Amino acid sequence: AETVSFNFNSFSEGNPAINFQGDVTVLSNGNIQLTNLNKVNSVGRVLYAMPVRIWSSATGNVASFLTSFSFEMKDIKDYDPADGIIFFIAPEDTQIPAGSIGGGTLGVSDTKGAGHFVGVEFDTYSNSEYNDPPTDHVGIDVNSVDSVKTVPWNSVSGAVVKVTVIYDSSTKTLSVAVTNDNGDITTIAQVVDLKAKLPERVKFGFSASGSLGGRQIHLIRSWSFTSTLITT
């Protein structure tokens, strides 16, 4: 079988295994900071440098994958804590949308909320133009920040959050488990056909953004990933 697996305990600029897009920066503690606290409509994204083959046009098979990561969002003065973080999957040529206004687009869609991607978002502001739930939430996105499904969640300022995701190729289920700082877990699952919504080659990463009045610290602290694709 064909397998891709890596494990970043910390990060560093200069590491060829990571592509940085937008206002991304690396703190001396090894943490990746996605947004610029002084830029309007700031957008920052990080991607696993190497493209990943999630399905084969020859066999018709689709890969399964186990991945885990931890992040943090902390408030600042005197901006509104926004907008959130999103773990996404997209075409290997994925780039920050042109004229991106950040905000609720999470740096992955256009102003209308559309884009070519699949991801799990950790939304901390309610953008009605995207039909967001009234409170903080985790959501499953398929080519849109207007989630196919969401679940109530709470973003604690300065809290270290852990996430684990499993994509069972056979059932096409994308399962997400979120462990908050206080110990409780929040989950959300949804059938998503990666073969129908994405190309054979893709890139995984994280993206975050803010607006003029909405800003906050967005940090990625760790990330492990393992995908396996059956060749016969």
Ligand X SMILES: OC[C@H]1O[C@@H](O[C@@H]2[C@@H](O)[C@@H](O)O[C@H](CO)[C@@H]2O)[C@H](O)[C@@H](O)[C@H]1O
Q: Would you state the structure tokens that stand for residue 141, as one six-digit string?
A: 């996105």
**SS3 state of residue 225:** strand
Find all residues with CB under 8 Å of 158, minimum gap 6, and list them.
72, 74, 75
Q: Taking a C-beta distance cutoff of 8 angstroms, is the pair 178, 70 a contact? A: no
- Residue 114 to residues 26, 143, 145, 159, 213, Cα–Cα distance (Å): 29, 6, 7, 30, 23
User: Toward ligand X, which CB reaches closer, 30 or 213?
Assistant: 213
Alpha carbons 126 and 153: distance in angstroms, whole number: 12
Question: Of these, 40, 187, 193, 197, which contacts a copy of itself (CB under 8 A)?
Answer: 187
Site string for Mn ion, 136-165 (x = CB under 5 A): ---x--------------------------
* Binding residues for Ca ion restricted to 94-133, rule: CB under 5 A: 104, 123, 125, 127, 132
- The annotation status of 137 as a binding-site residue, yes or no, is yes
Q: Per CB under 6 A, does 82 bind ligand X?
A: yes
In DSSP terms, which residues pair with 187 in a beta bridge?
A: 177
User: Toward a copy of itself, which CB reaches closer, 6 or 40?
Assistant: 6
- The annotation status of 79 as a binding-site residue, yes or no, is no
In angstroms, give the least distance from the CB of 208 to ligand X.
11
- Residue 124 to residues 75, 97, 210, 219, Cα–Cα distance (Å): 11, 21, 11, 14
Closest to 4 measured CA to CA, from 176, 195, 166, 224: 224
Question: Of these, 72, 83, 123, 136, which contacts Mn ion (CB under 5 A)?
Answer: 123
- Residue 133 to residues 124, 129, 141, Cα–Cα distance (Å): 10, 11, 14
User: Toward Ca ion, which CB reaches closer, 123 or 141?
Assistant: 123
Q: Give φ, ψ of 6 to 5 degrees.
A: -150, 170
Question: Of these, 75, 80, 110, 168, which contacts ligand X (CB under 6 A)?
Answer: 80
- The annotation status of 127 as a binding-site residue, yes or no, is yes
In angstroms, give the least distance from the CB of 225 to a copy of itself.
10
Site string for a copy of itself, 213-232 (x = CB under 8 A): ----x-x-xx---xxx--x-
Site string for a copy of itself, 104-123 (x = CB under 8 A): --------------------
Positions in the binding site for ligand X (CB under 6 A)? 80, 82-83, 103-104, 125, 127, 210-214
Q: Which residues are annotated as a binding site for Mn(2+)?
A: 121, 123, 132, 137
